[PDB]
Design a protein around this ligand. Structure first.
Ligand SMILES: Cn1nc(C(=O)NCc2cccc3ccccc23)c2c1CCN(Cc1c[nH]c3ccccc13)C2
Length: 62
């Protein structure tokens, strides 16, 4: 699905050695710029074992 392809791309981003130690907020804004919704961003963080609440994601994007 188009959604699953966005989430797959996001997971690979979040796993990268240069990305992983950087702050959550910068990762979230980057992923929104690539077309992800807040809910897709939330799914991607959980898929890399770094779960974030939707509340936190939405507050960053607000
Ligand atoms: C594994 N990886 N994938 C990407 C990347 O941007 N992938 C494409 C992509 C990523 C996420 C969602 C996408 C949705 C649709 C199409 C493409 C998408 C990057 C990386 C490694 C780091 N890239 C440079 C980068 C960009 N922002 C950074 C912040 C801290 C450190 C590095 C970066 C960017």
């Amino acid at each position: 699905s188009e959604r699953e392809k966005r989430v797959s791309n996001a997971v690979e981003f979040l796993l990268d050695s240069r990305v992983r130690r950087t702050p959550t907020s910068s990762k979230v804004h980057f992923l929104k710029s690539k077309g992800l919704s807040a809910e897709e961003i939330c799914e991607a963080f959980t898929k890399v074992g770094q779960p974030k609440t939707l509340n936190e994601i939405k507050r960053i994007l607000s």
